[PDB]
């Protein structure tokens, strides 16, 4: 069934699972036409498919050509996502195929279920968690490869860099979701926090800076700051 706070450690057990987030698949800018009407212009997007235990990210880039001449694009986008996830599963060796796929939005349940009919033993699950994966396009290297794509493309990343050498996957996922929640709530400030110190760099083969254990504690504190200070400004506390 649905995934929530009560069954959160299940993410880090040894059953292979993937999160699928479709938020950034169909992206547009809205603008005025010469006649003063409104139109949309699509820009490149991506499917965010993540193994939360290993950090492996399968970033399928969605090039704007896939929308040419199509109608009802927001609906098509969900089916295209499901097609691409199904294609990815079929491409993996049997022993790497997931046992469960968790979709971050419930509107992906039926499209994915239909595309995976051939895989009756893979569970398709929703979640009650409000995960911040939409903010993936605030990670500079991910945004860069999506916007530069001139054709459909899959790019593989480890979204945890080398963190699992030093911390568990529960802690790594917690750090990731904190970083992404901060980038989603106030991107400019979150990015200021992460790069303010010119002496801490991002390795060529990494996504995030090379913080020591102690610096991650400072960084993580600065991000909380931000999320709790917003909550109050948004509601009252």
């Amino acid at each position: 069934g649905a995934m929530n706070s009560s069954n959160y450690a299940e993410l880090f057990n040894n059953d292979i699972k993937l999160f699928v987030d479709d938020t950034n698949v169909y992206r547009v800018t809205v603008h005025k036409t010469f006649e003063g009407n409104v139109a949309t212009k699509a820009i490149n997007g991506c499917i965010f498919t993540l193994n939360p235990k290993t950090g492996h990210l399968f970033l399928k880039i969605i090039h704007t050509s896939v929308w040419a001449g199509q109608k009802r694009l927001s609906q098509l986008a969900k089916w295209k996502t499901a097609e691409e996830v199904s294609a990815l599963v079929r491409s993996l060796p049997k022993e790497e195929q997931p046992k469960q796929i968790i979709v971050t939005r419930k509107a992906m349940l039926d499209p994915l279920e239909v595309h995976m009919l051939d895989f009756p033993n893979i569970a398709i699950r929703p979640t009650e968690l409000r995960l911040p994966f939409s903010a993936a396009m605030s990670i500079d290297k991910l945004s860069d490869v999506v916007m530069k794509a001139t054709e459909p493309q899959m790019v593989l990343f480890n979204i945890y860099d080398d963190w699992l050498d030093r911390i568990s996957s529960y802690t790594a996922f917690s750090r990731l979701t904190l970083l992404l929640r901060a980038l989603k709530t106030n991107e400019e400030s979150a990015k200021m926090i992460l790069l303010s110190d010119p002496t801490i760099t991002i390795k060529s083969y990494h996504l995030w800076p090379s913080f020591t254990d102690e610096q991650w504690i400072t960084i993580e504190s600065q991000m909380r700051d931000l999320i709790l200070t917003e909550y109050g400004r948004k509601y009252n506390v």
Binding site: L76, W79, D110, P111, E113, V114, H115, L117, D118
Partner: protein, 300 residues
Amino acid sequence: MNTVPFTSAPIEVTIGIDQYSFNVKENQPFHGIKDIPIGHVHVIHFQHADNSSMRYGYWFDCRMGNFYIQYDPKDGLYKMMEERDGAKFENIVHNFKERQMMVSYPKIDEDDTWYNLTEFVQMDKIRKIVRKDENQFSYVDSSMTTVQENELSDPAHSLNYTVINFKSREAIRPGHEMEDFLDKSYYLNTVMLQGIFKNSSNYFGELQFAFLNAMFFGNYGSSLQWHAMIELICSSATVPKHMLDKLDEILYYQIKTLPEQYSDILLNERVWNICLYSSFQKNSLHNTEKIMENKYPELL
């Protein structure tokens, strides 16, 4: 006009014969039902006064044999039987008619209700849904489950309706996932009509039989089947014009006949709102939409 005699009525019971019902008291001198119209299937059904649990009954066609009812005190129910001795039967019936011990099928001459509810229903197809090949008539009751229900437990006592499942490989062509899920025409016209049912008459017959079992017996799996068969047509963009027109007439008479106070359990809000207001055929069921809006506006 044919007759279904009763040996006796040892237990107090409400007896249905099609849309009509009457009460028989314990050991009242009741010996059956006469003047049953030839040319239609019929259902004779029972609800005991002591235990309203278990509505049960029999589908039959008087052209296929001479049938009677006899209470069984061991199994505790009124059983249909076939009498093979034609002269014994004619003689039994004539004596009961002479003593005026039989009630009369009270068909108003203007009234086409039963025809309209059973237009496509044939005994031979009933007997393939309800398997008991040694009898010419078919027993159904409130509790019998469907083949599809047993997949999600006694097979000999099941309703073998055609399984419809919108998220199934039968329903969804590889490479047409979005197309086939959002427009069910492939599944309706190729898989079901051409492949399984062969024609729309057999499709409508099963739809009508499912409705009647839902209504007369409270059979939940039959209600599920009726709604699935409606939804499959309404969710198809491409349906023959004659099928839509006939479906509207079929549903109109079903909604007209439904007891007002059973609508809450016999009608699925989601299916009907989708069919009448969101689906491809939202504008093709004028008679059904008009009666639904005037009789059951709450459901919508």
